[model samples]
Target: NTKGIDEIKNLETDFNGRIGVYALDTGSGKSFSYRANERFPLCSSFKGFLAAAVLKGSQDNRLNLNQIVNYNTRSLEFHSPITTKYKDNGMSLGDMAAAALQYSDNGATNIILERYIGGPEGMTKFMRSIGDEDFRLDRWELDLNTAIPGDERDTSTPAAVAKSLKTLALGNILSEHEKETYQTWLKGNTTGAARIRASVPSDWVVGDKTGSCGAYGTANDYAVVWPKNRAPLIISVYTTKNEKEAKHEDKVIAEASRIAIDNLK
Candidate 1:
């Protein structure tokens, strides 16, 4: 009954590099996977899991959302508009959460990871607690600005990322309030607009997280897609080793989203 599976299979031929994609019907748990088990550098898409962890902390009373944190020039990181806007200022844990998720701010992400979760080891334990074994991160966001060995780069499979989004979106692991807060951050996300959301309907609500490594030629967008009067769908796309411009990867994801939406409608 679904045309999306074959459509995704056909769409893969149009891309130049490795592509990992998965789409899930939230109501039925029916899904599609193409190279879904293959691992790829997650880039900022890893932040989704981090965001979930922080929200869980808030729920557990380990940290309060309004707790203040200070930042300085040393905390500023490149490619983050947040640093330029709020130079060396203090922000709340909740505000930093917004900056990290919506702006994909490296400095904010590093602060959350280092200050709250106790860095990569803590993050690893959090991921395992959420039932995700394939999600991986060894280096912090500050380390990602420079070149990283392919083996050492943070990574996740398409299936894992999709599942993470599903769990967060459906309130399975996250409390209802936590899910609402996380999705609100995703709703305000400013990156990867030309990817999955580019070809979808204007009113179709999609709360998403995006990650891209230009140096590594990796692009990813994982989201919860809402269709009118129908169940939401979880679609994840990860493209790596791209030979063309980053825009090409965005186009591939857009095409994939278009196909999936058309069939589901």
Candidate 2:
């Protein structure tokens, strides 16, 4: 009955790359899936989950989100735009999480990983604890952005991302306060201006995290969208190309998301 997959297949031809999508209608449990179980690089998209992990730690009384970290230039990594500017003073743990999710700030991500989350391994651990067995964070940023063809490291499936977002955002995986906090951070992110955000209607509410990887046309966006008077929709759109030099386009992501939403009913 759901033939929207055909539109998505044609989209792959136009994009000159492979695409995967998973979308869920929270009201009726309706869904859309196209190559959704295939592995795709996580890129900076993992920062979305990283924020959730920090909140999970907060649940255990293990972290004070308000605590500030006064980092040095030695700690900065490439693409550390926000942290580099604030090195003189320092930023709160909560602020760093915002930078990571909001700007995909690499340096802020590493500090959160090294200091509290215990690196890639611990991140994978957190995902499993939350019932996302497919999520992985194989390396630190810069290196992790290495989206080499056929590599399985630092990858997750579209199905896993979409489902997990639903669980984290609207399910019991987090307390009310933490869930709202993370959701607000996601809704405020500025990097996805051209991805899923472009696909959603202006009157609707959406919170999303996007990832752009190195080599190949590798990139993705995962989001939870709220429509008026109905349960929200959860979507994950991922893409990767066969050649190292291929570039990803925001229009393709937006088109795929549009298809997912149009046919998910």
The most accurate candidate by lDDT is 2
> Over the stretch 156-187, how does candidate 2's per-residue lDDT look in tens digits?
99999988888898899889999999899999
**CA lDDT of 190 in candidate 2?**
90
For each candidate, what TM-score against the reference? 0.89, 0.97
Q: Which lDDT values do the candidates have, in the order given?
A: 0.77, 0.90
lDDT of 1 by residue, 148-265 (tens): 3355457778888887778777857878888889888888888868988897788888888888876546778888888777788899888776443444367887887676555543
